[PDB]
């Protein structure tokens, strides 16, 4: 549908070198020019921050922070690019405008399908070996709360979790496990709250 | 109500591999990447194509400039080469494993650089090139990369699995084992 | 180079 805007690469100028390390080994060296242009939406397009980050091999050397309005060197390796690009006033004007011409432009497109995306979690509870496992899988977005309850009272100790696990295919999963020694008749409840759920999902397990 | 999101355009060019990458990231997940060779937009989920488009030749121009910028950085720094970052490798199922129920094994390669790996799936000790998929090099918050390799499988108690990852930071290609336990 | 449209 609607075409996305993008950050167009800026040309670096050579001529100056720094005194000596980094980058691979002697028998197998490598060289990496790496750039991440980050549009930060703190509350949609109401508050937007642009953070461009330049990496050479393993070292972040240059940044452009829209709250600064100019390029700033993170290490000495990035200072020539900062001095070169900050001497270009039209570049700086164009860069500062990209919170609108790129960031807010692309958000309105992604607001149609990426922002409202919701996948309902699948909740399963099974014992092991003890350890009560609450499996919450195949949900989106990542914002989720998984609580263990024993006799309706929230258990805040003995929790062993994998944390939020990113599957890489726009789904999440997690395992929240409770170390309990269960007395007869005890009711264990795993409660899950998620933006895809109008009401909390509850799965019970009785000892 | 509040909408908190981070959209990242990540790109690199790597020598001596002469390989470039251009991708968009949304809250830690790939939206798309541009096939630099074929100049086409590859959406992470097919349904994304209905809502957005990208002129892929813009990425090819970026990589050409990044290619020339890399030569500038190579002239600027002359540091002793001595650092590769070995990866974290985790093997796990996409869903709870039930016998006879099709599932997906995830080989999660994390916290590594440079962005070059060689990954082999092993079912019962022999490579499997069928029912496998793979992502491009995904960005992290820091300077390192992560990557997903997937293997569709049918859970059984007779089979075992290994994801073998080779990387320049590894003295020896490491394989992470996986087998079904009820 | 890249042959761009138009």
């Amino acid at each position, epitope marked *: 549908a609607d*075409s*996305l*805007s*993008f950050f*167009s*690469s*800026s*040309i670096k*100028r050579g001529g100056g070198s720094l005194v000596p390390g980094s980058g691979g080994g002697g028998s197998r060296p490598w060289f990496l020019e790496y750039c991440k242009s980050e549009c930060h939406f703190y509350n949609g397009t109401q508050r937007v921050r642009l953070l461009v980050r330049y990496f050479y091999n393993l070292e972040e050397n240059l940044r452009f922070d829209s709250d600064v309005g100019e390029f700033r060197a993170v290490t000495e390796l990035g200072r020539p690019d900062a001095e070169n690009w900050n001497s*270009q006033p*039209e*570049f700086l*004007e*164009q*860069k*500062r*405008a*990209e919170v*609108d*011409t*790129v960031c*807010r*432009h692309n958000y309105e497109i992604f607001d149609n399908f990426l922002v409202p995306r919701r996948v309902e979690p699948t909740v399963t509870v099974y014992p092991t070996k003890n350890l009560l496992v609450c499996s919450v899988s195949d949900f989106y977005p990542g914002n989720i709360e998984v609580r263990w309850f024993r006799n309706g009272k929230e258990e805040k100790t003995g929790i062993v979790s994998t944390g939020l696990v990113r599957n890489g295919d726009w789904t999440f999963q997690t395992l929240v496990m409770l170390e309990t020694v269960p007395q007869s008749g005890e009711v264990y409840t795993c409660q899950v709250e998620h933006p895809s759920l109008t009401d909390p999902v509850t799965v019970e397990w009785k000892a | 109500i509040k909408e908190e999101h981070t959209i990242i355009q990540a790109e690199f060019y790597l020598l001596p591999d002469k390989r470039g990458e251009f991708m968009f990231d949304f809250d830690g997940d790939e939206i798309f990447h541009v096939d630099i060779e074929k100049s086409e937009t590859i959406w992470r989920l097919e349904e994304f194509a209905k809502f957005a488009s990208f*002129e*892929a*030749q*813009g*990425a*090819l*121009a970026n990589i*050409a*400039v990044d290619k*020339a910028n890399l030569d500038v950085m190579k002239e600027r720094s002359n540091n002793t080469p001595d650092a590769n970052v070995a990866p974290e490798v985790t093997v796990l199922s996409r869903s709870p494993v039930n016998l006879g129920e099709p599932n997906i094994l995830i080989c999660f390669i994390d916290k590594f650089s440079p962005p070059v790996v060689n990954v082999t799936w092993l079912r019962n000790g022999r490579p499997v090139t069928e029912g496998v998929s793979e992502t491009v090099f995904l960005p992290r918050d820091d300077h390192l990369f992560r990557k997903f390799h997937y293997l569709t499988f049918l859970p059984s108690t007779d089979d075992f699995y290994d994801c073998e990852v080779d990387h320049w930071g590894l003295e020896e290609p490491l394989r992470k084992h996986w087998e079904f336990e009820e | *180079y*890249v*042959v*761009v*449209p*138009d």
Partner: T-cell receptor
Amino acid sequence: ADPKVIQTPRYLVKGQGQKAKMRCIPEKGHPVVFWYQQNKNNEFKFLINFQNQEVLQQIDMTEKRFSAECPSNSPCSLEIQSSEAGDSALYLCASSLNWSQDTQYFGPGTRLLVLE
Amino acid sequence: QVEQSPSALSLHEGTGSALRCNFTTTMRAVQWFQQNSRGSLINLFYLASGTKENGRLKSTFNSKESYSTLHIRDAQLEDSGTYFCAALRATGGNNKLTFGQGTVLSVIP
């Protein structure tokens, strides 16, 4: 202090099938060069752009009918291999300090006319 | 092509008027040119946002509303020529300037 782009010749007349070569000297220090085609209807058609000596983008007509160069020891050049009456236009050369981040400064252009 | 108006403009010496360019998509920035009788494009403005003033000229660019204007005041004979806006498509993979139709300005002596 204004950047200046040089272009020769100012005018050019050629017959159909002849080569029509036009030269451009970008502003000293500008690594990016553009070539546009402006006809009598004030329509501007992008032809090709350079990063130093390397072509980055060009349309199909330029690649198949034109020969473009921006060597380091010589002015930039744009040459039509077999001129056609439809090639009659003002050929503009522009240079810029950066790839897409700064002003494109244009030269006086070459007024090319291709007759039968 | 960018929509530009007016297509022609006759201005008495010492008076003012304004040109405008409408964009159908988000532009990174916009340049304004004055192509004189010699046919050479004279750079007037580079705008990524806001308003700039150059002598008797003045220009504004609004990226969200996708338009740019050029104001001429105290018109002089040397202001004659064909005025063009030109912008970079922020969504365009082709790195090129997209030109407006142009305004043919004549300064009445």
